[PDB]
Amino acid sequence: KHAIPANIADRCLINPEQYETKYKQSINDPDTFWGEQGKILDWITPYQKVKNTSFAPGNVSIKWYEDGTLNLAANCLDRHLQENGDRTAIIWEGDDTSQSKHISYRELHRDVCRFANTLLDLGIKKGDVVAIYMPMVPEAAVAMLACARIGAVHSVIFGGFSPEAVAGRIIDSSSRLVITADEGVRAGRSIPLKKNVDDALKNPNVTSVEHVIVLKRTGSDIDWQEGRDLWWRDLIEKASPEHQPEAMNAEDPLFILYTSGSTGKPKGVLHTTGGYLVYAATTFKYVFDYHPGDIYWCTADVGWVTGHSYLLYGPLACGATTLMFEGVPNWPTPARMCQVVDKHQVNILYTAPTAIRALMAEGDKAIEGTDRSSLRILGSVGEPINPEAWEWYWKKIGKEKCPVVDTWWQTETGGFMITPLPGAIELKAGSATRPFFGVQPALVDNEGHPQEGATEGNLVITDSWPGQARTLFGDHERFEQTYFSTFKNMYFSGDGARRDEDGYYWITGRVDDVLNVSGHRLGTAEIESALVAHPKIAEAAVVGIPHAIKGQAIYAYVTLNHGEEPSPELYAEVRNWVRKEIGPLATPDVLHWTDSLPKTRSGKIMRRILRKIAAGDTSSTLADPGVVEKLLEEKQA
């Protein structure tokens, strides 16, 4: 247990008693609690209904603030203009540190308005899906906000996805438009964004895209399709900076984020507007102990939910200054992240255990020549962090001075679910601690039996909360089954957790067939499909193994078609194939050639034995037992 330091106790918005009181009321009386708390936002017509939800088998229905209207872009921009139009909305720090920007709330609003008009003239309407495939530049934020302003439904696709991965997301969403850049810049290198868009758009199944809008970021020689492709600058220049925001209904679709699951290819997790935004703003405020003037930096990419809720929307709803870094925390040197912290006097740092671990491998080289005094609060997100990395982060980055908020949540939860509050809750290294306001966690065994006291089990949430995802795009039925059918009447996270005697949660990772690689969520089944689509592969089974930096790496067991033969050229080819099917994020670290997949009566494949072997272990009965011996020997090279 870490004590709350006196400087936080002196300023904190939520103290221990406040946490207890607000939490109790959020459970007992959600309508009063969230009816009051919803006023963190401006509404165009005020809501009357607040909580109206059900996890009931075959009638899953989540509505928050339903009869109220609002606009997300006016809450994140317009309403800040009168008094704080000159406050920096976004600090942009380039890969190359000589390149930066302060974009005032005024400047940002003006651009969102011009870009809203641009989208509107191109024929984009409320409800249309817009695919955003952009590097970490401020224009990505401009694009996302402008979509929300006019009520279109943006789908941000992470820059590191391959053409094949982009196209799938375009097809499932029926995106009418792609917004991208000529190239992204990361670690001194160019990322071929627009070319990737070119290749994705040649897939014969893509039929919905009418235009691609291209940001001239590096000025690279790119292929151009006349009529389809439009320069960002040409368009926005011609567009009026005047735009009135129209009322959106609280339950109007805000965005889609494609997410990996246990089965199938990734599905489009859908968020609406009112509930999502209240929850984002609220969690941001209280968990980062945000005070006006605090310089806030979340390192996560715009392409992930953390990038949606804690890079842009939450921060901006609260009128914060938020920092968007173009590059990587360790380029040119491991000291970079902290150079960034010093250069912009960052007070809140929210980052990833993978990054932390990579910085930790380099020890003091991660802090040499840097000061870090400006920091008051740290956060960790996206995967479990073990005590030792938590301790090193607390100590070297926070100089033993900063509460670390380890925030547990998911794309499907919209915002933080189980998390410390810096002035309310004493910290245990590696523990996400206590549920947030509105959040009712429980642990169950594999049969759904609730586990009481200090115990472990399958982590579920037993009631709704304002930021909850509302559906899977085009597939509400799959939403019911993926999340509300294992444990009837309950939200099943896919995670396992331990609860200790204080009621602190310790998230131990996914209990379904989902991997966490560098803090990226990936389905084993989707990697196997990508392997089997190779004309030389017959079958594959993919597991996670522990990895010092990355958390888990991908260890693929691969059965070649009859006749074929392993070579070192084949190893690289198959890695490059997975990379083109999905992307670098999903490249297997190890290929284990085998004719010895362990199967049952029916072809069902034995995953537990495959896991342990890959971990490098030696300690049930299948359909042919002598393959466990073969699979061990094979593992010794």
Ligand X SMILES: CC(C)(COP(=O)(O)OP(=O)(O)OC[C@H]1O[C@@H](n2cnc3c(N)ncnc32)[C@H](O)[C@@H]1OP(=O)(O)O)[C@@H](O)C(=O)NCCC(=O)NCCS
Indicate which of ligand AMP, ligand X, none lies near residue 273 (CB less than 5 to 8 Å, by partner kind): none
Q: In one letter, which amino acid is 509? A: G
Residue 579 marked as a ligand binder: yes
- Which of 147, 213, 381, 586 contacts ligand X by CB under 6 A? 381
CB of 420 to ligand X, least distance (A): 18
CB of 255 to ligand AMP, least distance (A): 14
Structural contact between residues 161 and 193, judged by C-beta atoms closer than 8 angstroms: no
Give 314's Cβ-side CA count (13 Å radius): 28
CB of 599 to ligand X, least distance (A): 33
Q: Does 297 bind ligand X (CB under 6 A)?
A: no
User: What CA–CA distance (Å, rounded) separates 629 from 206?
Assistant: 47
CB of 276 to ligand AMP, least distance (A): 15
Q: Does 493 bind ligand AMP (CB under 6 A)?
A: yes
Residue 213 marked as a ligand binder: no
**If you write DSSP's letter for every residue of 249-267 in order, what string do you get?**
ETTSEEEEEEE--SSSS-E
Q: Does 157 bind ligand X (CB under 6 A)?
A: no
Nearer to ligand AMP, 245 or 551 (CB): 551
Nearer to ligand AMP, 88 or 354 (CB): 354
Residues 562-591, interacting with ligand X (CB under 6 A):
584
Residue 518 marked as a ligand binder: yes
Residues 332-391, interacting with ligand AMP (CB under 6 A):
381-384
Residues 307-326, interacting with ligand X (CB under 6 A):
none
CB of 191 to ligand X, least distance (A): 4
* Residue 97: closest CA among 193, 163, 185: 185
Residue 102 marked as a ligand binder: no
| Sign of CA pseudo-dihedral 178, 184, 186, 189 | positive
Indicate which of ligand X, ligand AMP, none lies near residue 147 (CB less than 5 to 8 Å, by partner kind): none
* Residue 288: closest CA among 196, 381, 378, 393: 378
* Residue 197: closest CA among 149, 135, 152: 135
- Which of 253, 422, 438, 519 contacts ligand X by CB under 6 A? 519
* Residue 58: closest CA among 484, 412, 492: 484
- Which of 49, 87, 101, 186 contacts ligand X by CB under 6 A? 186
Token pair in block for residue 535: 């004309």
Binding pattern to ligand AMP, positions 418-457, x when CB under 6 A?
--------------x-------------------------
User: What CA–CA distance (Å, rounded) separates 577 from 533?
Assistant: 9
Q: Assign 3-class secondary structure to 302-369.
A: CCCHHHHHHHHHHHHHCCCEEEEECCCCCCCCCCHHHHHHHHCCCCEEEECHHHHHHHHHCHHHHCCC
Nearer to ligand AMP, 406 or 480 (CB): 406
**If you write DSSP's letter for every residue of 261-305 in order, what string do you get?**
-SSSS-EEEEEESHHHHHHHHHHHHHHTT--TT-EEEE-S-TTSH
CB of 494 to ligand AMP, least distance (A): 6
| Sign of CA pseudo-dihedral 7, 10, 14, 18 | positive
Angle between helices 105-121 and 138-149 (to 10 degrees): 60
Nearer to ligand X, 328 or 606 (CB): 328
Q: Does 49 bind ligand X (CB under 6 A)?
A: no
User: What CA–CA distance (Å, rounded) separates 111 from 521?
Assistant: 33
* Residue 527: closest CA among 456, 587, 571: 587
Q: Does 458 bind ligand AMP (CB under 6 A)?
A: no
The one segment of 46-54, 299-307, 483-491, 504-512 that binds ligand X by CB under 6 A: 299-307
- Which of 518, 524, 552, 559 contacts ligand X by CB under 6 A? 518
Structural contact between residues 150 and 119, judged by C-beta atoms closer than 8 angstroms: yes
Structural contact between residues 393 and 469, judged by C-beta atoms closer than 8 angstroms: no
Q: Does 622 bind ligand X (CB under 6 A)?
A: no
CB of 257 to ligand AMP, least distance (A): 8
User: What CA–CA distance (Å, rounded) separates 589 from 586?
Assistant: 9
**Facing residues of 591 across strands?**
556
Residues 520-539, interacting with ligand X (CB under 6 A):
520
Structural contact between residues 397 and 453, judged by C-beta atoms closer than 8 angstroms: no
- Which of 69, 162, 249, 411 contacts ligand AMP by CB under 6 A? 411
Angle between helices 163-173 and 568-581 (to 10 degrees): 30
- Which of 26, 173, 249, 259 contacts ligand AMP by CB under 6 A? 259
Token pair in block for residue 94: 């380039």
Q: Does 118 bind ligand AMP (CB under 6 A)?
A: no
The Cα-based distances of 155 to 52, 177, 233 in angstroms read: 27, 10, 22
Number of residues that this document lists for the chain: 637
Nearer to ligand AMP, 156 or 213 (CB): 156
The one segment of 214-222, 317-325, 442-450, 518-526 that binds ligand X by CB under 6 A: 518-526
- Which of 170, 352, 556, 631 contacts ligand X by CB under 6 A? 352
Nearer to ligand AMP, 411 or 594 (CB): 411
Q: Does 300 bind ligand X (CB under 6 A)?
A: yes
Q: Does 516 bind ligand AMP (CB under 6 A)?
A: yes
Indicate which of ligand AMP, ligand X, none lies near residue 408 (CB less than 5 to 8 Å, by partner kind): ligand AMP
Nearer to ligand X, 68 or 307 (CB): 307
Residue 231 marked as a ligand binder: no
Residue 382 marked as a ligand binder: yes
Residue 411 marked as a ligand binder: yes
- Residue 490 burial by Cβ neighbours in a 10 Å radius (0-12, 13-18, 19+): buried
| Sign of CA pseudo-dihedral 122, 127, 132, 137 | positive
Q: Does 258 bind ligand AMP (CB under 6 A)?
A: no
Residue 42 marked as a ligand binder: no
Angle at 89 between CA 140 and CA 315, to 5 degrees: 80
- Which of 507, 578, 591, 627 contacts ligand AMP by CB under 6 A? 507
Count of C-beta atoms within a 10 Å radius of residue 571? 15
CB of 417 to ligand AMP, least distance (A): 9
Residue 408 marked as a ligand binder: yes
Residues 224-243, interacting with ligand X (CB under 6 A):
none
* Residues that constitute the known binding site for Mg(2+): 532, 534, 537
Contact residues for ligand AMP, defined by CB under 6 A: 259, 305, 381-384, 406-408, 410-411, 432, 493-495, 507, 509-510, 516, 521
Please give the annotated binding residues for CoA, written as ranges: 186-189, 306, 330, 518, 579
Binding site listing: 186-189, 306, 330, 382-384, 406-411, 495, 510, 518, 521, 532, 534, 537, 579
Where along the sequence are the contacts to ligand X (CB under 6 A)?
159-160, 184, 186, 191, 300-301, 304-306, 328-329, 352, 354-355, 358, 381-382, 518-520, 584
